[PDB]
């Protein structure tokens, strides 16, 4: 079994990031804790999430690993509150799934791993031009390039170290500042990247304010997002497409 | 005429319960107090309602029975709110209706009660293994089931005295599980009944939390359920359509 | 220039007025303030918008007019708060828009004022049975003629001084009945007016509670309505077209 009473606050967080990617949930449970990770179909988005040491009360593992009707447990996930622990009992077969919350017993078939998709693997990166950010204006700064350009710019290095959100169109513009003071951390470097806002929509619909955002930035690679989104328990890797940086 | 002040929270819960399953209302007001109650189109939902002594300041009477054009007062008299108090002065006329709150004044048409419907009668039924449990957690039960399984079974009595909510359906099944404590009331018998979730949705669509549900169990035939549904003010019984209890 | 640091809370009534009958803002930068008005297609609303001193914390002028891309600030501008110091910055040139919020600079390509519509002028009218009321019973008077019948009575002068907005149509009517006390002014005259509802609709949906209503009452012409929406420091003029008064 996996015996994980777990706040459900953790909940949402969780099975919902992939969501925005994918459907179905190949599932990692190790001997530190369960994470998750996939490419949606298009392959241009991949979240690796890796859940912690002591986010639920106990747990007991010995590998164990499930692919899950994420596309079922999605809204039935979401009908419960963050301020209730929960419980995940898969000890007695891979083809249910049994939950605990508030009196509520249920039970899923579940799908074998091995029959899904390929589970990716860690592209090997090393960045520099890191950024910081909280969540509230990182997706303030993608409200705003949410319709004069398709997708965002995260140019880094103007004029040596600096940050800029912008998105150029036929007649219009835009352009997100962000200086050093009360930014919580920067890496001065010199790499700028291109992104498709829409793909990052989906992504940070999810992240109103207080998460702290980490952009691996460099140049024109796939950008890497590196989060703990609800009391500082969980990560999110977001690994958006890149583009050509003309403009 | 019929003189009444009523608080202005007994508005939208009196007129909408029946809106589920009719539009046109016939209206009873009788020397106690003024009642409603009929069978939708497909007979698949029948609340009985019945409206009390001195829910309204003062109020006269003497037969004097309406059919109203519920699907015209349903969205004008929701303009409204709870914090006022209405009046019913209809002595004039059965053509018309007026109303008063806060200023305005409505005069509505009213059809004759004897060109409707049938007006049904009360199945005078006696149950065993009554039910009791506030809507909050009725409506969250319903919730449960609302995507599972297409109908709620109230399975009663599950190894003595027992409820339950759950829903099978293919590769996915569901659970409510709800013993005595903290349970306000129990009749602890035999009967368990199945209904269709769906005609039970509508119903408790509009029962949020703090409504005590009362839940009169027996084996597959239509439950009762009475209601007190605002500061304690009123009923709404609802019968559902049996369904054969096989699963 | 335009030097202005506007109030956040300025900027979504200053530039949603007109949008519910324009999309193209002609915009006037006089040296007391910066006003707006025009004529929607149909030719059946025109609201004189005129900004006032001191709005903004500082300014400076001299003639300078723009259109504005309306249906593009329109939303762009909306994704900013109150709580904010806005400014309006147009020196370089009058291809481009640049303003200030929250570390976001913005840059628009601005049409020339002469090529869109002509501009109108102000109706030279006194009216008689001028009304007050605030917006928060207005609209709610609105609420009501919004299903019943299809315009708004104004009607004026119900047995020497009185208010009416009411709404007659087949089998269900409704009335509005508006006395002198605690309505903060009154002028009571003789005249009442007809207008569309719906035209009254788009005007008032913004306009929620505590925004003092005036209404220029005449028989039978465009009925002048006179507001200061936010902190107190704006106007917003909708004349709407009358209709011939029977019934």
């Known amino acids: 079994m996996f015996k994980a009473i777990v706040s459900a606050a953790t909940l949402r967080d ?3 990031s992939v969501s925005v990617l994918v459907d179905e949930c190949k599932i990692r449970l190790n001997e530190e804790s369960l994470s998750i990770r996939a490419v949606d179909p298009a392959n241009v988005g991949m979240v690796d999430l890796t859940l912690d040491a002591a986010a ?15 596309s079922r447990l999605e809204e039935v ?12 009992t898969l000890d007695e077969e891979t083809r249910k799934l049994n ?10 078939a579940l799908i074998d791993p091995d029959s899904i998709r390929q589970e990716p693997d860690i592209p090997d990166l090393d960045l520099a ?34 940050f800029h959100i912008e998105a150029e169109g036929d007649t219009d513009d835009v352009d997100l500042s962000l200086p050093p003071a009360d930014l919580i ?31 691996e930035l460099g140049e024109e690679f796939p950008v890497k997002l590196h989060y703990q989104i609800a009391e500082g328990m969980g990560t999110i890797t977001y690994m958006l497409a890149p583009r050509i940086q003309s403009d």
């Open 185 to 215: 951390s920067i890496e001065a470097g010199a790499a700028d990247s291109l992104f498709s806002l829409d793909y990052l929509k989906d992504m940070n619909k999810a992240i109103p304010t207080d998460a702290e955002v980490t952009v």
């Open 99 to 108: 939950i605990r919350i508030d009196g509520l017993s249920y039970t899923l």
């Open 56 to 70: 639920f009360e106990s747990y007991e593992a010995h590998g164990g690993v499930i692919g899950v009707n994420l």
């Open 129 to 162: 031009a890191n950024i910081v950010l909280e969540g509230t204006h990182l997706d303030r700064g993608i409200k705003a390039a949410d319709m004069v350009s398709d997708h965002i710019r995260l140019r880094v290095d103007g004029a040596e170290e600096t």
């Open 77 to 88: 996930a979401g009908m419960a509150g963050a301020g209730d622990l929960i419980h995940l």
């Open 14 to 16: 969780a099975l919902d």
